[PDB]
Design a protein around this ligand. Structure first.
Ligand SMILES: */C=C\C(=O)N1CCN(c2cc(-c3noc([C@@]4(C)CCCc5sc(N)c(C#N)c54)n3)nc(N3CCN(C)C[C@@H]3C)c2)CC1
Ligand SMILES: Nc1nc2c(ncn2[C@@H]2O[C@H](COP(=O)(O)OP(=O)(O)O)[C@@H](O)[C@H]2O)c(=O)[nH]1
Ligand SMILES: [Mg+2]
Length: 164
């Protein structure tokens, strides 16, 4: 069963590192910030043999029909910010609104992801992020691509939401 997932958020939050942890089970601390591609992973989720097709976004900020059609292929979206970057969290509402527009839906499967949870000096609090996820009616997952904390929780929760 195929699930088309899209990982979005400001560049530098760890979209690539999270995707590589899921696919390859290791931390890649350096990955060209301009590389945008789809990566496939066969995994078992709640007994179902899944094919995850994950689009790790980069590109340009472009509101063309071509880019909208490309993003519209996504079934579920991980909206990622970094816990030590207030700007990336403030940007979440823009990503949520563009997803809602291209999918033409108020309940697109989404998970709010607070990455870099291994770091000791945060600027965005768990309470404010939990509250934003509550405003959207979506789950909030704390992750670390460095340690693998929350990686399956984020992706598998998104699959469960698509499956529902
Ligand atoms: C690291 C790579 C890089 O240089 N960039 C440039 C900045 N950039 C970017 C993209 C977006 C943005 N807004 O929506 C999207 C997605 C990818 C989200 C899913 C749905 C759709 S439909 C569609 N078309 C697009 C696109 N593009 C999307 N990406 N926003 C921003 N900014 C930064 C400036 N700020 C005032 C507004 C917004 C938060 C930047 C791409 C990565
Ligand atoms: N400490 C820490 N650094 C991370 C984590 N995820 C990514 N990084 C770092 O954050 C930067 C951006 O990562 P990258 O995967 O390129 O993010 P992207 O631009 O969103 O694809 C790099 O310096 C990574 O080493 C994480 O969970 N913890
Ligand atoms: Mg990247």
């Amino acid at each position: 069963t195929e699930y088309k997932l899209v990982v979005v958020g400001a560049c530098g939050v760890g979209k690539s590192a999270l995707t590589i942890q899921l696919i390859q089970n290791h931390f890649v601390d350096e990955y060209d910030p301009t590389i945008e591609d789809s990566y496939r992973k066969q995994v078992v989720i709640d007994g179902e043999t899944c094919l995850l097709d994950i689009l790790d976004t980069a590109g340009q900020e472009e509101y063309s029909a071509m880019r909208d059609q490309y993003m519209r292929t996504g079934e579920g979206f991980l909206c990622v910010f970094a816990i030590n970057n207030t700007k990336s969290f403030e940007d979440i509402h823009h990503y949520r609104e563009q997803i809602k527009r291209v999918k033409d839906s108020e309940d697109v499967p989404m998970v709010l992801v607070g990455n870099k949870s291994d770091l000791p000096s945060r600027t965005v609090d768990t309470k404010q992020a939990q509250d934003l996820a509550r405003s959207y009616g979506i789950p909030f997952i704390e992750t670390s691509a460095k340690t693998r904390q929350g990686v399956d929780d984020a992706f598998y929760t998104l699959v469960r939401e698509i499956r529902k």
